[model samples]
Target: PARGTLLTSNFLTSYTRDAISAMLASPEQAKCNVRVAEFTYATIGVEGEPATASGVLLIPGGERCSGPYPLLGWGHPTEALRAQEQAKEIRDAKGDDPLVTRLASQGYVVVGSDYLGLGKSNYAYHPYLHSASEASATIDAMRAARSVLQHLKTPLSGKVMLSGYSQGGHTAMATQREIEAHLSKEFHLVASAPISGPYALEQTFLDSWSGSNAVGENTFGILLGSYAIVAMQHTYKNIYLEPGQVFQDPWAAKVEPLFPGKQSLTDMFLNDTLPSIDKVKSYFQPGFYSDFPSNPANPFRQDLARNNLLEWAPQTPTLLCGSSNDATVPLKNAQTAIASFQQRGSNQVALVDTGTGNASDNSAFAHMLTKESCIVVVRDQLLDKQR
Candidate 1:
């Protein structure tokens, strides 16, 4: 796991260098020291008044030059790995995590947002299903990070590029759409690349079921619960018994006695194994909408076709990446996204099919969206200002 591949090297060379320059241009750079700065952020739709979002600002070691630099808006995958472990891997994965470290090495300021409820909150809700909220929170974290780094005298150029994989890829797409629509003037997102993501939430479910692996069946609850919670939080009016609570209540009474709060509730539900779909359905069936497909729901369906992104038009160059052999997120989803973005009149839209047969599900597919495979494409299209 602690290996650095070619992708890692490319990231250090380009994207990261651009990111750091935009945010934390600091004295450490003057002293040739690379430092990581931590910051807090909040979300608009999250339940709490001030839900804390966490992120790290990586400042490249170098001489302070009198110029503005590009920024890389990076989002890490929502894997089981701890924040500390991820940070370590980024710093010393032997060029493995090029997306982060490579950018840092190249003098590009890179910022990785951990999203809401992850590192900052004790019960860090995965929020996988709630794509919009996750994207908003990540962008918010970027906003917060840039502000802090600016205050520290690192005047950024405001030119940004978004990139992520899997859950983060979903966030990356959301963020790009948001920046184009809302913050276009202030945030110049030159380009964006989202690799191995659930581009189509609904179709992915069908794809997974058709496959014979246990991953789809096993991770279903988590995938369902995240989207359900986000949907209930924003879409449903009577929130209590709308979509999620309907299903959650069956075992809520039984489970509530076992665990007190949200975190504990999540832990118990995930850990407590049940006998049959009958038992789980006794709780889940009620909450899901009447249209709940016999097949698993695609989390994206909840907000699909809706203008979750502030503006429908994308101003920057966009690169959509997906794997053909990916069992989790079918290539069809990526194709659909490409068509959607292009239809919206994005002249610079591009799609990279990260040739298949490497990974089983979305997570593996996400990893497969490695910086190495994409760096050349990004450099030619995005970095080539001459174009």
Candidate 2:
């Protein structure tokens, strides 16, 4: 079976330049009309079996924007979508969200994968932060997008740019690692921008477990960690025997079914289905802190170690962007990644500071606080490199 073969495509919608501008930092920042389409294609699931995946293919169009658009693959952060139109559709598909709208309007053809289990795919759960499947789903979406372009008669420049935010920052970096390690012959990776990604996932996990005061207002860390554990269990299968092994009573009872579904985190927070300031440790079984690492086996720890995005070098020029004061994903992840890349002899990478000020840089959403800011900086770097 053809992995990237396009299975189904539908015209999603078109955004006038004016409408596109509304989504950008400035009202008139948009440069061209943007067209969108929702599509599904063949890819492997977390278990390495054939799976269906879906995403949006965003194309730049207009008299102001001409032929031969360079391609960009956008990796997204943690999301909950029980419905396909939530992200996979192009017509009303805004799931590529604001940054993608900005990029496509400025003349880049972008593919935003809904990833396994999140969209049209029938997989029972999302892989959450797993790298291999993230790379596979993204790369396959790029394959399907190429076919979509041919059907529309769009000219492609044959250059590919990679960008993602938060969880996607980790994903975009993982995508690049996959292409550089194995698919270099197939893709011409020109540039990469991973904004506020958790590249040092091992440290992130440790910090979460202790309720590290370094990232202020980190109650949401529990939800994020929960999502990762559930998805990790799904992907690796051996990570845990049961939810209770990893979580406290009430949460252990409810956390399993809450994810890979549309249960709202915010509503859960508002209604007390989830705790807002509970220390990451308070919700976890105390044994997780003491446990197998000291004695037997911590499967969650073992799996996350396998999934961290280091140990390989990316040859493409890269730009890392995030705020130093950011609490959501500490800038340290970027620092560690870029330093690690340079240590491995990858020198084309640099970090861009997106910090506004201390007043604006607090909270678990601090990682998201600079979303548009980081997107603009990223938009410029790749736009400058686009032919």
Candidate 3:
């Protein structure tokens, strides 16, 4: 099936620049009126078949904008549906909608993917941190946006700016890599802003699994890993031949059906579906805990390394933004990944540290918690400057 072939588009909401500006003053102000829609588009699943996922497409009133404005594709952070949260409805990222105001109102057409399994997606399991499907889903979301934009008579210059925070940061970079590597002829990518993403998955993330890393002491790194590994195995059948290969007994039996289930991390801990707080090593089988890293034959480790977004040279000008005080996705993830891009002779990669906002003050939103600050840099520094 042709990827990104728009199957359905449902208009969800609309707002004026002035209204949005009044509403969202945290990140930045809005610049134009926007019409929002929830779209069901075709994309590839982890198994590489035609997959349908839902995402939002935001168009600044095309008439007011001059003509042929560049499009911004946003990668949204993860939302593991909690037991109380309902996925029965679209439940798209519209309730606290910011993209409409932040970038779309500023005149760049914007769209964001709810990723594989979150927002009314037919795909039962989320690929989570798996880079291949993340890129594929995000790129298809771009195509979905373009198709709707063209239908709305919104002239697009065909210049694409990709951006995301946290998991979205990872997806944004992956989408950028996929476009430049595979779809350069189809889409012209101008800039990428990955805000507080875990690009160096193996370096920062896997190290966190050891529970020995600096942030591991007080972070949900392992919880993220638990879900990520479960999601990975769902995508790649061999990450482990058996559940016990990775998870300990009670966890092994309980985790398989629970993750990608409708339970939140806090709920999981409360219900005892997951280990107690920061019991990182206990979550894994002793063999996996000590052996996964050094065990070259381990599929779990293999996928983590494979999904690492650091090996390739990014061709587009990229702004990697993060905060030093981040414990969720450490600043080192961006710091480590940027070095690889530079090593690949990509002079366009720039690393900007927003600041060391205290985690206590910021509530560990420090992960992509530097989110609001980085959104300013992305909107003003990258997306605008690229134009």
For all predicted structures, in order, the TM-scores are 0.66, 0.93, 0.89
Query: What lDDT is obtained when candidate 3 is compared to the true structure?
Result: 0.75
Best by the lDDT measure: 2
RMSD of 2: 2.4
* Runs in model 1 lying further than 4 Å from the true structure: 1-33, 47-49, 63-67, 79-96, 121-126, 209-291, 294-311, 356-387
TM match of model 1 to true structure: 0.66
Candidate 2, residue 320: the lDDT equals 88
Worst 10 residues of 2 by lDDT: 86-95
Off by over 4 Å in 2: 22-28, 84-96, 279-282, 292-297, 357-360
Error of 2 at 203 (Å): 0.8
In candidate 2, what are the lDDT values of residues 2-99, reduced to their tens digit? 78989999876678876767766434477778777888899997768889988888888888889788888998777755444434344544424664
What tens-digit string does per-residue lDDT give for candidate 1 at 171-228? 7888877677677876777878776666665555434432222322323333333343
Return the TM-score for candidate 2, rounded to 2 decimals: 0.93
lDDT of 2: 0.79
How far off is residue 294 in model 2, in Å?
7.0
lDDT of 3 at 291: 80
Query: What's the distance in Å from true for residue 31, model 1?
Result: 16
